[PDB]
Write an enzyme that holds these catalytic residues in place. Structure first.
Site, PDB file in Angstrom:
ATOM      1  CB  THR A  15      -4.769  62.187 -11.023  1.00 60.39           C
ATOM      2  OG1 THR A  15      -4.297  61.010 -10.372  1.00 60.39           O
ATOM      3  CG2 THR A  15      -4.632  63.428 -10.170  1.00 60.39           C
ATOM      4  CG  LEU A  16      -4.741  57.665 -11.998  1.00 61.32           C
ATOM      5  CD1 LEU A  16      -4.003  56.678 -11.099  1.00 61.32           C
ATOM      6  CD2 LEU A  16      -4.201  57.605 -13.419  1.00 61.32           C
ATOM      7  N   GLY A  17      -8.938  57.040 -13.538  1.00 59.42           N
ATOM      8  CA  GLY A  17     -10.073  56.107 -13.432  1.00 59.42           C
ATOM      9  C   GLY A  17     -11.355  56.805 -13.035  1.00 59.42           C
ATOM     10  NE  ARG A  38       1.153  57.729  -2.793  1.00 64.17           N
ATOM     11  CZ  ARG A  38       2.061  56.926  -3.377  1.00 64.17           C
ATOM     12  NH1 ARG A  38       1.719  56.048  -4.311  1.00 64.17           N
ATOM     13  NH2 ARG A  38       3.330  57.001  -3.009  1.00 64.17           N
ATOM     14  CG  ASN A  89     -12.561  58.328  -6.365  1.00 60.54           C
ATOM     15  OD1 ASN A  89     -13.346  57.431  -6.696  1.00 60.54           O
ATOM     16  ND2 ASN A  89     -11.359  58.533  -6.896  1.00 60.54           N
ATOM     17  CE1 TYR A 155     -11.206  48.413  -2.079  1.00 66.01           C
ATOM     18  CE2 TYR A 155     -13.187  47.074  -2.120  1.00 66.01           C
ATOM     19  CZ  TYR A 155     -12.405  48.066  -2.678  1.00 66.01           C
ATOM     20  OH  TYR A 155     -12.846  48.704  -3.797  1.00 66.01           O
ATOM     21  CG  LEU A 194      -5.018  51.138 -11.835  1.00 68.00           C
ATOM     22  CD1 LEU A 194      -5.309  51.622 -10.426  1.00 68.00           C
ATOM     23  CD2 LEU A 194      -3.518  50.883 -11.995  1.00 68.00           C
TER      24      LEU A 194
END
Ligand SMILES: [Mg+2]
Ligand SMILES: [Mg+2]
Lengths: 251, 251
Positions: A15-17, A38, A89, A155, A194
């Site tokens: 939904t983003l990026g 989310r 992703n 990460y 972001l």
């Protein structure tokens, strides 16, 4: 161009990026797409922005939610027919060294970045194998699957895990003639809203000591390699790592 | 030859196999050693077999046990003085593909092979930084941190995670002048009593398509590279992977 003719893709965090760019190019190339995220306010607007419900829909899911993966596959197949393509992703970050990582931070990041990718890979193999779909699982990673960053300890752990876990899955699927390929994609720094929200982040990432090209990438840089990996053009590629990083890891 | 003069080492999973060989050679080279393991019947015999309590002791610990880590560093300091050297060697295996891994198997293996190594590395940095000890954290791994094995999916995830997490930790320690090095060690196949108890296992591991040398290694092969890494001989080595595998990954 129809490079993804007949494909049915799930894109987590679509939904983003980067995920949204992958979704957009997948629809442009003829794939039906289910994007997850989310938040339903963001997700429904994102799907409608890309295409009609026969092309792209949204499904609300946290990739760390093991039970929700079953409903996601069921909803995608109900909408579009059997899933051929999975892009793992969805991911998060913690800005801490290993030393300064709390156990809560460690567990939260691994739940999305490692457990969620495991849940999607494992279920995707089971649902995608032996159907003549030219199935492809694309596990998103990053340069931090290759090199350390002193302030991204958990990460780094998650990206190294997905890098090698993906090779295991690729091999099992190839040896068992499952008609499922598994590969990893490793972006360097990519400009998104972001990154834009963090003063000085792009400027630091664009230093030549970080990205030799002296600028960062854009979401379509990752969408185009994902079209190649989802397509039957890459039918001999499995267990491989595809880096798109402006030179970051070359020095 | 006193190559570990004055060193104080914790070796997790030090009561058997590779861990016990590392403990044995560390004592030979002048280190004081605390070995850990699950079973006090095994661990007390193992310590006594190697040396006197001034040289080597046992501490009962599951490496997945976060509070136990605090107790282990406290016990080792009380016995031997400040810890200089940590070998994260405790590990387990699940013989499953990614596809066939249950969530319980996934979480059990990551608890030891990943969380435990994180708990040890994090606490080790905190306790051994800035003490002029020539501190060294050796994160045990295997060839499965480099290459997939179709029937070791979770194990592959754990080894890839530790491989890159260790680079993060190495960099942060170097940049902050902490006097802590972090490296990984990657055995190929190693002969142990556990391999001896499975008919045909060593023969299969010794096939040239697996191990080009046509035989497998022995625990001392890993002990010797660990002496180098714990010693001040390796004071410029950090963030590196050291492979000892009979040629496995060269082909
Ligand atoms: Mg239409
Ligand atoms: Mg570099």
């Amino acid at each position: 161009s129809n490079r993804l003719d007949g494909k049915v893709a799930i894109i987590t965090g679509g939904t983003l990026g980067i995920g949204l760019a992958i979704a957009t190019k997948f629809v442009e190339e003829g794939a039906a797409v289910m994007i997850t995220g989310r938040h339903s306010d963001v997700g429904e607007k994102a799907a409608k922005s890309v295409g009609t419900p026969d092309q792209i829909q949204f499904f609300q899911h946290d990739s760390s939610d093991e039970d929700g993966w079953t409903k996601l596959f069921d909803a995608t197949e109900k909408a579009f027919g059997p899933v051929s393509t999975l892009v793992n992703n969805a991911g998060i970050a913690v800005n801490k060294s290993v030393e300064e990582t709390t156990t809560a931070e460690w567990r939260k990041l691994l739940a999305v970045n490692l457990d969620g990718v495991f849940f999607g890979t494992r279920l995707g193999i089971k649902r995608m194998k032996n159907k003549g779909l030219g199935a492809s699982i694309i596990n998103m990673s990053s340069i931090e699957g290759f090199v350390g960053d002193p302030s991204l300890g958990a990460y780094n752990a998650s990206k190294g895990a997905v890098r090698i876990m993906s090779k295991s899955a690729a091999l099992d699927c190839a040896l068992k003639d499952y008609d499922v390929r598994v590969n990893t994609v490793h972006p360097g720094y990519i400009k998104t809203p972001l990154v834009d929200d963090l003063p000085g982040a792009e400027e630091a990432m664009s230093q030549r000591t970080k990205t030799p090209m002296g600028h960062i990438g854009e979401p379509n840089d990752i969408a185009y390699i994902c079209v190649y990996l989802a397509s039957n053009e890459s039918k001999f590629a499995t267990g491989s790592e595809f880096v798109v990083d402006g030179g970051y890891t070359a020095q």
